[PDB]
Design a protein around this ligand. Structure first.
Ligand SMILES: N[C@@H](Cc1ccc(O)cc1)C(=O)O
Lengths: 147, 147
C-alpha cells in the first residue's frame, strides 16, 4: 500500500534527504501539511528508516574497507553474532547470506595493521572464522532505486 | 585538516541528516552562521557527498537482494565494467576488490526470477561471468563510524 504520491516523495528524499516540505509539496502537487503528514506516515511504517548524510570515509580516516565473510567456529547455539558485533564500531553492515558462510560484514579501518587487529577482535568476539576481501575502490554506492 | 569541530558535525549529520542548521549549533556551541559555512565547505571539500533518506527495500518490493561477484571474460578488452553497468539501475553499488573476482555488486530485485534475468543482462552488457550470493536478512546497514 504505497500510492503514486508516496513513490514521488521517497524517490525525492532518496535523492535528497534534506528536500524541504515546501519543495516536496510543490513537486507532488500537495500542501505542505499534506506532505508533512504523508512523510510521517512513511516514517512510522518503516518505509523511511532515517536520514543520514553521506560521508566520504577516506576524508575521515577510513583508508581501508573490506568485506569480511564469517562463519561459526561451532555452529551449535542460535546465532549470536550480529548481536555480539553490534558494538564494534568499525563494522558498518552485517548481513546473513546463503551458501557456505553465514554473515558478510562491511568493515572500515585506518590501515592494514588496523585491519589485522580488527579481524582478531571479530574472531574473538563472535567466535567465528573469517574470509576477508579488501575493497580497492568504490565506483558508486547506495544508489537507491524506487521502481 | 578536519578540525574536530567539523568532526562533531559529521557525527551529528550521519546519525541525522535532517538535524537543522540551528539544533546542530546548540550541541556544537556555534552561531547558526558559522555552522552554515563549514557545512558549505564540508560539501565543497568532498567530505559530505550528499543527503539521503534511507528507504527500506522490501517496502518498495525489492524482496531479494544479492552480492554479485563479477569477473570479465576477456582480459584483452579494456576493462570498463563499472561504467558499462552504471546505467542498470538495480545495481546499487559496485566495488573492485582483491579476491577471487574482479568486482562485487550489491543488487536488488523483485524476486529470484527477476535476478536470473538481471544476471543475463549483466553478463551480456559487461562481458562478465557472475557468481552470486543471496542476502537472507540485513541486520544493520550504513552505521557510519567517525573516529
Ligand atoms: N549459510 C546458510 C544460511 C545461514 C545463514 C545464517 C546463519 O546464521 C546460518 C545459516 C545456508 O546457505 O543455508
Amino acid at each position: 500500500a504505497l500510492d503514486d504520491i508516496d513513490r514521488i516523495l521517497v524517490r525525492e528524499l532518496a535523492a535528497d534527504g534534506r528536500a524541504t516540505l515546501s519543495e516536496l509539496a510543490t513537486r507532488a502537487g500537495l500542501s505542505v501539511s499534506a506532505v508533512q503528514s504523508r512523510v510521517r506516515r512513511l516514517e512510522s511504517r518503516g518505509v523511511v528508516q532515517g536520514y543520514s548524510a553521506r560521508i566520504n570515509p577516506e576524508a575521515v580516516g577510513h583508508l581501508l574497507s573490506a568485506f569480511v565473510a564469517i562463519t561459526p567456529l561451532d555452529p551449535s547455539q542460535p546465532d549470536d553474532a550480529p548481536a555480539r558485533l553490534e558494538h564494534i564500531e568499525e563494522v558498518e553492515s552485517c548481513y546473513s547470506v546463503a551458501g557456505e558462510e553465514s554473515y558478510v560484514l562491511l568493515v572500515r579501518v585506518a590501515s592494514a595493521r588496523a585491519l589485522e587487529d580488527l579481524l582478531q577482535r571479530i574472531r574473538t568476539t563472535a567466535n567465528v572464522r573469517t574470509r576477508s576481501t579488501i575493497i580497492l575502490n568504490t565506483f558508486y554506492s547506495d544508489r537507491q532505486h524506487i521502481p
